[PDB]
Amino acid sequence: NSGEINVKPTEFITRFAVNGKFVYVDQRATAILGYLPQELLGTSCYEYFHQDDHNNLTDKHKAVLQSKEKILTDSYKFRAKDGSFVTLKSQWFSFTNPDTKELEYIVSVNTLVLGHSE
């Protein structure tokens, strides 16, 4: 059956330029919590995130961008297209060109839980 497909789990993968949007998003984003590669892609990370921890998210991703070749992991909080206010648990690596050794993107992965274990 050519119509067979599967896009699960409760995780996704992404790229964000030092720009405030995920300049690339993967379709497991369409599965994890449910927003496209167009409802999350070229869509403002900071404004489309929770009312609080968007600072922490921004403080963390500058802690990724702080260097050009390293990886950080923290808990975050996110809300998909429909109504799924949810956690995110994510890891972001600064990505260098290096044609020039400039910082050129932040490549990354994302995971969630329904809430913290506390």
Swiss-Prot record:
Residue ranges of the motif Nuclear export signal 2: 33-41
Induction statement: Constitutively expressed. Has no circadian rhythm expression pattern.
Function: Transcriptional activator which forms a core component of the circadian clock. The circadian clock, an internal time-keeping system, regulates various physiological processes through the generation of approximately 24 hour circadian rhythms in gene expression, which are translated into rhythms in metabolism and behavior. It is derived from the Latin roots 'circa' (about) and 'diem' (day) and acts as an important regulator of a wide array of physiological functions including metabolism, sleep, body temperature, blood pressure, endocrine, immune, cardiovascular, and renal function.
Protein name, per record: Basic helix-loop-helix ARNT-like protein 2
Domain PAC: 73-116
Tissue-by-tissue expression: Expressed in fetal brain. Highly expressed in brain and placenta. Lower levels in heart, liver, thymus, kidney and lung. Located to endothelial cells and neuronal cells of the suprachiasmatic nucleus (SCN). Also detected in endothelial cells of the heart, lung and kidney. In the brain, specifically expressed in the thalamus, hippocampus and amygdala.
Record's subcellular location: Nucleus
Oligomeric form and interacting partners: Component of the circadian core oscillator, which includes the CRY proteins, CLOCK, or NPAS2, BMAL1 or BMAL2, CSNK1D and/or CSNK1E, TIMELESS and the PER proteins. Interacts directly with CLOCK to form the BMAL2-CLOCK transactivator. Can form heterodimers or homodimers which interact directly with CLOCK to form the transcription activator. Interacts with NPAS2 and HIF1A. Interacts with PER2.
Lineage of the organism: Eukaryota, Metazoa, Chordata, Craniata, Vertebrata
Ranges of residues in domain PAS: 1-68
